[PDB]
Amino acid sequence: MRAKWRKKRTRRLKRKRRKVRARSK
Amino acid sequence: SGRGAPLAKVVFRDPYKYRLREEIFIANEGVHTGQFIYAGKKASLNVGNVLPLGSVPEGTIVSNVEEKPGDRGALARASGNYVIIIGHNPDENKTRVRLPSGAKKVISSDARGVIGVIAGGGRVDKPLLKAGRAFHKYRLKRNSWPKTRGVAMNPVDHPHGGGNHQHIGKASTISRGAVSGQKAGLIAARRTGLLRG
Amino acid sequence: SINQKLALVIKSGKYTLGYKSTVKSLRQGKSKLIIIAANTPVLRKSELEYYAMLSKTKVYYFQGGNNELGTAVGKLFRVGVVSILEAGDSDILTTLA
Amino acid sequence: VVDPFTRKEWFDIKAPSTFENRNVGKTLVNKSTGLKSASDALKGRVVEVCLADLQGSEDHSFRKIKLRVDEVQGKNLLTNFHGMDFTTDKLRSMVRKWQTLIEANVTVKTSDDYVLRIFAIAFTRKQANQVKRHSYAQSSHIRAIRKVISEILTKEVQGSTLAQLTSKLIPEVINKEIENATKDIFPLQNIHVRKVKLLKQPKFDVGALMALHG
Amino acid sequence: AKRTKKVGITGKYGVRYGSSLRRQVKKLEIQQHARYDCSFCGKKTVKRGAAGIWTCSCCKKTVAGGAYTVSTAAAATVRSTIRRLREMVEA
Amino acid sequence: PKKRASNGRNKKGRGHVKPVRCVNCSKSIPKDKAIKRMAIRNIVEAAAVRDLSEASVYPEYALPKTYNKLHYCVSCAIHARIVRVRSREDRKNRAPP
Amino acid sequence: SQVFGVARIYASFNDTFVHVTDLSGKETIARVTGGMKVKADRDESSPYAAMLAAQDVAAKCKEVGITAVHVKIRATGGTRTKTPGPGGQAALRALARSGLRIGRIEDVTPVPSDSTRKKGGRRGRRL
RNA sequence: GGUGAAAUUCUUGGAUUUAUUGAAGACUAACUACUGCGAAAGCAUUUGCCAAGGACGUUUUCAUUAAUCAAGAACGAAAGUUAGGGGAUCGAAGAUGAUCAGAUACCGUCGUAGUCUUAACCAUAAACUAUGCCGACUAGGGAUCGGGUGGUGUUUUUUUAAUGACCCACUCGGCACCUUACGAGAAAUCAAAGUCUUUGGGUUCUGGGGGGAGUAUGGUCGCAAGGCUGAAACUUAAAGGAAUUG
Ligand SMILES: [Mg+2]
Ligand SMILES: [Mg+2]
Ligand SMILES: [Mg+2]
Ligand SMILES: [Mg+2]
Ligand SMILES: [Mg+2]
Ligand SMILES: [Mg+2]
Ligand SMILES: [Mg+2]
Ligand SMILES: [Mg+2]
Ligand SMILES: [Mg+2]
Ligand SMILES: [Mg+2]
Ligand SMILES: [Mg+2]
Ligand SMILES: [Mg+2]
Ligand SMILES: [Mg+2]
Ligand SMILES: [Mg+2]
Ligand SMILES: [Mg+2]
Ligand SMILES: [Mg+2]
Ligand SMILES: [Mg+2]
Ligand SMILES: [Mg+2]
Ligand SMILES: [Mg+2]
Ligand SMILES: [Mg+2]
Ligand SMILES: [Mg+2]
Ligand SMILES: [Mg+2]
Ligand SMILES: [Mg+2]
Ligand SMILES: [Mg+2]
Ligand SMILES: [Mg+2]
Ligand SMILES: [Mg+2]
Ligand SMILES: [Mg+2]
Ligand SMILES: [Mg+2]
Ligand SMILES: [Mg+2]
Ligand SMILES: [Mg+2]
Ligand SMILES: [Mg+2]
Ligand SMILES: [Mg+2]
Ligand SMILES: [Mg+2]
Ligand SMILES: [Mg+2]
Ligand SMILES: [Mg+2]
Ligand SMILES: [Mg+2]
Ligand SMILES: [Mg+2]
Ligand SMILES: [Mg+2]
Ligand SMILES: [Mg+2]
Ligand SMILES: [Mg+2]
Ligand SMILES: [Zn+2]
Ligand SMILES: [Zn+2]
């Protein structure tokens, strides 16, 4: 749970939420 | 017309008769109308000037340079291109030079070149944007445009022709020792696929 | 100083600028020293140089071009040549090399 | 498998007249066989020697000097000046901490047309009565100290021929003359012309060489 | 008013060819239509002819130069390198 | 808790210093933090000089020292003999030997 | 009355070099390196290997006529070590006690006014 | 060659090493420090031009013009983005030789982008003194950088001067340091982190248990990577700070 990487993951897996809410148009 | 670089019309008096012989050079970046140009072994080292290669120090940047002496210019004539001199061998005078393509090469130290860089550099940095822009490009060059892929023809017309899908079928890298009618594709290629260099 | 020996000249003295005024300044011998910009053509330069020998008027060549000399005399236009007529209370007439 | 040394021959080296001890040593070259001109394999070589050897005394035990082989008069190699440098120990021992280094260079051309770069070194020293431990210069003194040094270094070349420069270097004369110009600006201790490098040479003129043979 | 946010001169092209390509020629169309100062008469009156042909309005010197600007960075450097070399054969 | 008043090491009043490279490790380290030590030694170890004394021509020849300045990162410096962990109250001392 | 060559050792780690040449440097005479007197693949740097190297070196220096030698020891340098390998001392001593006349030694290891990046990454060679 | 030791690689077309040269691009060693400068980010080769700045000096000048600041602006390491140059070195990716139970890690050889640069973006770092700025006051001591003042003072010896260097003494201003607390603090420690329950000199920002979460949503900036602003359901009795003994 190194913050640097609990936070890389937090972004890796939040642009994914952004890029999948645009499929749903 | 049809040349990226511009040309310099340069006039000299005739040494052996009372007239003018005008010469048609390729313009090096920086020479201007009304400039004086100096041509020959003792001519000084400034852009515009033609000198034999053995008479220019190692590092000089030159264009329109001869392969054999007196051929009047073979290497490095297109816009923005030049050759660097890398060294000398005054025993049987030869001069090593690097060409635009990155090829090194040795040529007779009497081979003349013009100091500086061919004008018009950077031409190929602008997107053509439009078929027509390239229509008129080859309008003034030769009937080589446009190009239909062989894969879109019938097998009567091209090694790549035919088939119920558009596909090449055998490998597309062709032996160098192939024969006319068979050399379509990547002739004598030695690798292939996207580079790492 | 170096360059502002011209700031002296415009206040404490009289000057004229441009080519065909500094031949009228020179055929009449009443010009003590002229300054020539760097980019004024060579043919122009040797004409003002010949008027120098005939008027016993010595000459200075300038680091910048005609765009730079204009601002050097606080003018807002290009000036290829300038003629000094009186230093008056300046420092330039004597002190040069 | 052939012992390539038996095909090789010795040539003794004589230095310029400007040096006390002229005959130095010997070198080696393959013998002049068919189209092989060992003369050409000889000229162009260079060798560096401590000034202790050229002048016998050891107060120039630093200061190596290079020398290059020009025309050979048959089995003797007459050589000409090529360049001088401070051995790295002498150099690295002058750069003690807690004191300011000063350096300058200037590329000048000599009476005989020789263009060359010459390097000066100098370290500020403490004044005798000092109580603070460092004796640093002040960057305006350094600029001033730098300015005067380049003027004398330039004035001595072109106010001297190259051979004259050899004549005026072995005595370390210009160190004093630089010491006699910066005395009023800051103390300074290790004033030295640290290096001399030959950048270009004129047409041969073998006459100048044979002036250095006796 | 400000006529447009970013397209600038490439408004003529409208919506076609892709924005990045349009942005790529905007750069060079500004360069090539610019008025360059004259190295001879000091006037901002040099404008491109054909590619590589730069010529001043009044003083009418013509300079062979870049395809879209009057002096490519490469030729500026080359002028440096030759000077550095010339300044040495001069010594 | 803050272990040293020098924070890491000896930089007060600039903000950024510049990096050097450990001679053993190659690691980047700010110059003010590096552990510095001079290897001032002769080119001869214990003995081997009077085994070379009569081996030399040149009656009068001094002994040239071989100079080289060394920078250590913290980790290397600790792992060699260069510095050692010190007590709490012993860390405030700048006596070399 | 005595004659001269120049020594030129290279005290690297992983190896030490000993080869002498005309005071010119151009024409050289027998090179022998520390990895010719061992074949363990590792200890080519070792002092023992350097001794056997100088001893086999000086013998060839006698066979042609080198009375004496000036020496120029040299670490790797560049951006790499500046501190000379362990088989430098051993070769030099194994050269005096070998019977050549000497004097005028310099450390010629190359050092930059510095420049160009060092290998390792900024976290250093970590093991 | 490289390494703990190896191997990948190179080599009788002579490598490695030597000597003589040449090119290219980055860097600015040693000198380099409890030293300087800058609003901060940061700035170390020479010289030239260009504007700028603090401190000091001052029986010059205006006279309250000032402190701190929602809104709004400039600058902002490294990496990253777009285009041209440049591309020696190092080198995310990658490729490989090892090591390993595995080892697309550490170590070894390569190596793309990158590293430099111009023209545009980006706006963030343990961007740290983890200490807002202005003002006032309250201990002891020795150094140092700048500027000034003083002395039959040492050398400069140019004869003595006079400067520069130095010495001693003062002082204004700055980077810091030592001792100590009389005071502060949970303590580590602190000359401010003091002049506070004996609680008020002026002002700006931020925090209110731990998670969830800098997430969701709206807005906005960005080409993008992302930045700025920013919840709630829900869950939990501790997380946490400093020190003590083992
Ligand atoms: Mg097609
Ligand atoms: Mg069809
Ligand atoms: Mg067919
Ligand atoms: Mg086929
Ligand atoms: Mg087909
Ligand atoms: Mg298809
Ligand atoms: Mg297909
Ligand atoms: Mg008129
Ligand atoms: Mg801790
Ligand atoms: Mg400051
Ligand atoms: Mg910082
Ligand atoms: Mg050193
Ligand atoms: Mg090895
Ligand atoms: Mg470890
Ligand atoms: Mg070789
Ligand atoms: Mg460079
Ligand atoms: Mg300083
Ligand atoms: Mg430096
Ligand atoms: Mg705001
Ligand atoms: Mg940045
Ligand atoms: Mg950046
Ligand atoms: Mg690029
Ligand atoms: Mg690269
Ligand atoms: Mg590498
Ligand atoms: Mg990998
Ligand atoms: Mg690796
Ligand atoms: Mg980039
Ligand atoms: Mg912004
Ligand atoms: Mg922040
Ligand atoms: Mg903070
Ligand atoms: Mg506070
Ligand atoms: Mg205060
Ligand atoms: Mg106090
Ligand atoms: Mg003072
Ligand atoms: Mg005084
Ligand atoms: Mg006094
Ligand atoms: Mg909470
Ligand atoms: Mg949002
Ligand atoms: Mg519980
Ligand atoms: Mg704790
Ligand atoms: Zn014009
Ligand atoms: Zn380390």
Swiss-Prot record, chain E:
GO terms for cellular component: cytosol; cytosolic large ribosomal subunit. Keywords: Cytoplasm, Metal-binding, Phosphoprotein, Ribonucleoprotein, Ribosomal protein, Zinc, Zinc-finger. A zinc finger (C4-type) spans 38-59. PANTHER family: 60S RIBOSOMAL PROTEIN L37A (PTHR48129), LARGE RIBOSOMAL SUBUNIT PROTEIN EL43 (PTHR48129:SF1). It holds the Pfam family Ribosomal_L37ae. Gene3D superfamilies: 2.20.25.30. Component of the ribosome, a large ribonucleoprotein complex responsible for the synthesis of proteins in the cell. The small ribosomal subunit (SSU) binds messenger RNAs (mRNAs) and translates the encoded message by selecting cognate aminoacyl-transfer RNA (tRNA) molecules. The large subunit (LSU) contains the ribosomal catalytic site termed the peptidyl transferase center (PTC), which catalyzes the formation of peptide bonds, thereby polymerizing the amino acids delivered by tRNAs into a polypeptide chain. InterPro entries: Ribosomal_eL37/eL43, Ribosomal_eL43, Ribosomal_protein_eL43, Ribosomal_zn-bd. Present with 44600 molecules/cell in log phase SD medium. Belongs to the eukaryotic ribosomal protein eL43 family. Component of the large ribosomal subunit (LSU). Mature yeast ribosomes consist of a small (40S) and a large (60S) subunit. The 40S small subunit contains 1 molecule of ribosomal RNA (18S rRNA) and 33 different proteins (encoded by 57 genes). The large 60S subunit contains 3 rRNA molecules (25S, 5.8S and 5S rRNA) and 46 different proteins (encoded by 81 genes). This is Large ribosomal subunit protein eL43A. GO terms for biological process: cytoplasmic translation. One of its GO terms (molecular function) is structural constituent of ribosome. It comes from Saccharomyces cerevisiae (strain ATCC 204508 / S288c) (Baker's yeast). It comes from the Eukaryota. It is found in: Cytoplasm. The modification Phosphoserine is found at residue 39.
